[PDB]
């Protein structure tokens, strides 16, 4: 079999658990003058160089003495061992994957391959972890006239491939990721297999480790307090000393975790980074070898006609490597800190909270036992304890190391907002799970409808409930509130005949309480409410209320994005990225915020009430405006268009049409004419003082049809740039929207007619999304043909000359317009242009 030589120092150094002291598990005797011990190896060197108590003042006695006559001594024995250790393994990890990217000194004519097995088999096949396209282009032989162009291109392709740095999309909440690391090294659990980014979303930094180490996390020992019977002054000192000692145990535990992190986990990540540096160098080297071999196949005539600089090729590739290494280093360093903060430190905090509990119990009992010898003051010392063991010691890495590189990567980690996510509920395999990395337990009961668009429905059923049990070892809100909640929601319209109960009956939707303190989200009709309840029962709320007398509401039964932030001074609600409300909460004392979270409708609700929700997240900091707006934009992104409610737009689904520039207008086939007239929406016609809306389920029933199954279907979702037919139902027939080919003016009425093939009419529409901000609107473009560059016009509404000469009568029609074609290129995109359309399907959350 193939044998690969590996230097000892390219192996992974991983300290064994036996390296670490379990002295923290020892008991401690606490007394009136017990001190807390801390060793600082960080030494002021100038204190030594100046110290004049250091160098001896005493004279050296004479070296002369009696002969040695006792020669007993142990003498070390040294022995060589073999310079080569042969081991047998059929595994392929970093060592094997790197070797597959090399070629021997007697080979020049190499080709790149994406097959690791081929690369090992054939000495002219070199493995590459870059894309199939890169590989194909590098293997390409061209004629001398094209060669210089092919060099430029493939060298630039190398720099682009090396610099790759994003996932499928930012909805995954991954800060940075270099997607080819798996393919480059196959470290960890076969990370060259499957999709690396996806596996990383599920499992995080752990997937890259070669070995998950067993951590030493000792049960901290009992404190044994000394009695000083009839000495108040020294009993108080003993309590104080036990409290100072408790801090030392926290500190020593964190130091113990840091030592293990550095010598079992961060060492593995270092080996990965070095591996990547070599891998990229191997790729560059192979490319250069390829470029040389191909250059030298050409004749001297050809060679003098080609201008290429080989040092320039080399420095451009090296420059690519340097930028790629920066990304890799930041990514891997983040992985290493992530493992420390999510997978190590919390298990320590768990043992230390248990110890704090036991110590608190002990210290109160000792204050009881000494109540007589501490008359009156006993209750004051009991509250000294309770208080002092309240604030949980923060982990600061810079206490345990002054390594600049480590401190800087820790700082970067803590300044990245996605690392503040402490709960991130996401759909996976017909369930919801926490993808934050802290492993909250999430129980979804049978009455919660889930779907793969990450939407979930809460109903009035008793079993329509989600329980989240939060990780108790996460520290957030140290001293003052500093957290945020974000989610999307869809709240159905009031029933017109149930308007009084809608207006008056508050119902909880999400409740997070422990010991009668915590937070909740509730709804009362058209108001969504965030409530804080502190340990003393003081209550503060902030709310967003949308107007239910709008002709057309942006919020009613439509998906919108909520973000709640809390800091020292204020609770704020943002809607769709914009601040809506603010409540001064300076009077709020402690709020217990890590009780179980129950998603469930609770209150005096109609049997038919429901709420949809999506992308529930909790952050352990106050998000800024700009963080929130970005999150809004990121979570709005899709390849698919959307309907009026915010759900994906579909083929073969009945839709009424809404115009964003003419909100109260709708399309009706004009009587005995094949054109679409524009009429005014009817409205709520009863007399509740609470209510006004315009009717939505009116005008022609449209339906979008796919132009061709020419490409892969597999679903009925409408995507941007798709070619469609826009059809509608006229009585029991299906008709179609056309544009007459001879289109002389700036605007022209659309032709609404039976399905029929005429050389005089265009029938093909490209559905567009010109807006760069989140929107449910789309645009409808007529082009000459699918492959044509030439644009005919956009579908819209315009006013056409109808009749009269002294007073001209004008009338609105459904039209095609050339004017919109220029308007849509203007920036920022005009949301309210009459070429912006939305499709309204019947929906159980809108009745009229």
């Amino acid at each position: 079999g193939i044998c690969i030589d590996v230097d000892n120092e390219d192996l992974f150094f991983i300290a064994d658990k036996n390296s670490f002291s379990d002295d923290l598990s020892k008991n401690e005797r606490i007394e009136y003058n017990t001190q807390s011990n801390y060793i600082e190896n960080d030494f002021p060197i100038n204190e030594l160089i100046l110290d004049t108590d250091l160098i001896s003042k005493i004279e050296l006695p004479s070296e002369n003495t009696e002969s040695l006559t006792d020669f007993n001594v142990d003498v070390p024995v040294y022995e060589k061992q073999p310079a080569i250790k042969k081991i047998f393994t059929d595994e392929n990890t970093i060592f094997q994957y790197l070797y597959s990217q090399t070629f021997p000194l007697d080979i020049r004519d190499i080709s790149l391959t994406s097959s690791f097995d081929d690369a090992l088999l054939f000495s002219n096949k070199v493995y590459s972890f870059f894309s199939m396209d890169y590989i194909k282009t590098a293997n390409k032989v061209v004629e001398a006239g094209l060669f210089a162009g092919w060099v430029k291109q493939i060298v630039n392709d190398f720099v682009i491939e090396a610099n790759k740095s994003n996932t499928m999309d930012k909805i995954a909440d991954i800060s940075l990721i270099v997607p080819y690391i798996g393919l480059a090294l196959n470290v960890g659990n076969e990370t060259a297999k499957g999709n690396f980014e996806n596996a990383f979303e599920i499992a995080g930094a752990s997937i890259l480790l070669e070995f998950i180490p067993e951590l030493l996390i000792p049960v901290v020992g009992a404190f044994l307090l000394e009695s000083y019977i009839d000495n108040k002054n020294k009993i108080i000192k003993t309590i104080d000393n036990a409290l100072t000692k408790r801090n030392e145990k926290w500190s020593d535990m964190y130091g113990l975790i840091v030592a293990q992190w550095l010598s079992t986990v961060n060492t593995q990540f270092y080996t990965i980074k070095e591996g990547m540096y070599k891998a990229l160098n191997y790729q560059a080297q192979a490319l250069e070898e390829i470029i040389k071999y191909r250059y030298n196949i050409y004749s001297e005539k050809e060679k003098s006609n080609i201008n290429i600089d080989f040092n320039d090729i080399n420095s451009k590739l090296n420059e690519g490597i340097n930028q790629a290494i920066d990304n890799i280093n930041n990514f891997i360093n983040g992985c290493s800190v992530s493992y420390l903060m999510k997978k190590m430190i919390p298990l320590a905090v768990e043992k230390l909270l248990d110890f704090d509990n036991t110590l608190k119990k002990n210290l109160l009992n000792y204050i009881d036992e000494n109540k007589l010898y501490l008359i009156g003051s006993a209750e004051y010392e009991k509250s000294k304890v309770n208080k002092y063991l309240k604030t949980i010691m923060p982990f600061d890495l810079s206490i345990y190391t002054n390594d600049t590189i480590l401190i800087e990567m820790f700082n970067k980690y803590n300044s990245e907002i996605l690392n503040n996510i402490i709960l991130n509920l996401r759909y996976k395999d017909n369930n919801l799970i926490d993808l934050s990395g802290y492993g909250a337990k999430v129980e979804v009961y049978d009455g919660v409808e889930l779907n793969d668009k990450n939407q979930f429905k809460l109903t009035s059923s008793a079993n329509s409930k989600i329980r989240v049990t939060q990780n108790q070892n996460i520290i957030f809100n140290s001293v003052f509130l500093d957290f945020s909640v974000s989610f999307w929601i869809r709240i159905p319209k009031y029933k017109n005949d149930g308007i009084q109960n809608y207006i008056h009956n508050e119902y909880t939707i999400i409740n997070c309480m422990k010991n009668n303190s915590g937070w909740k989200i509730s709804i009362r009709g058209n108001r969504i409410i965030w409530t804080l309840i502190d340990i003393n029962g003081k209550t503060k709320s902030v709310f967003f209320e949308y107007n239910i007398r709008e002709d057309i509401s942006e919020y009613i039964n439509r998906w919108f994005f909520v973000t709640i932030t809390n800091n020292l001074n204020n609770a704020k609600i943002y809607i769709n990225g914009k601040l809506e409300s603010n409540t001064d909460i300076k009077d709020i004392r402690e709020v217990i915020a890590n009780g179980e979270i129950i998603f469930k409708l609770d209150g005096d609700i109609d049997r038919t009430q429901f709420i949809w929700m999506k992308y529930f997240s909790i952050f352990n900091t106050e998000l800024s405006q700009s963080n929130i707006e970005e999150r809004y934009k990121i979570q709005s992104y899709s390849e698919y268009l959307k309907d009026f409610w915010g759900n994906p737009l579909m083929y073969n689904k009945e839709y009424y049409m809404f115009n964003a520039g003419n909100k109260n207008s709708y399309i009706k086939l004009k009587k005995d004419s094949p054109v679409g007239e524009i009429l005014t929406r009817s409205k709520y016609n009863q007399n509740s003082k609470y209510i006004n809306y315009r009717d939505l389920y009116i005008g022609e029933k449209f339906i979008i049809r796919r132009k061709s199954n020419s490409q892969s279907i597999n679903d009925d979702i409408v995507r941007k740039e798709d070619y469609i037919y826009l059809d509608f139902f006229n009585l029991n027939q299906e008709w179609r929207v056309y544009t007459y080919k001879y289109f002389k003016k700036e605007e022209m009425k659309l032709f609404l007619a039976p399905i029929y093939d005429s050389d005089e009419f265009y029938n093909t529409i490209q559905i567009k999304e010109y807006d760069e901000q989140p929107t449910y609107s789309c645009q409808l473009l007529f082009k000459k043909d699918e492959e044509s560059t030439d644009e005919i016009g956009l579908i819209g509404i315009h006013r056409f000359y109808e009749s009269g000469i002294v007073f001209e009568e004008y009338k609105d029609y459904f039209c095609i317009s050339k004017w919109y074609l220029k308007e849509v290129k203007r920036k920022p995109y005009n949301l309210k242009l009459g070429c912006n359309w939305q499709f309204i399907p019947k929906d159980e959350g809108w009745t009229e």
Partner: peptide, 18 residues
Amino acid sequence: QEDMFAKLKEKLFNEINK
């Protein structure tokens, strides 16, 4: 049907030429 379409086309032309 063909015949419908042709009659509708004439109606369209009359609308366009208002």
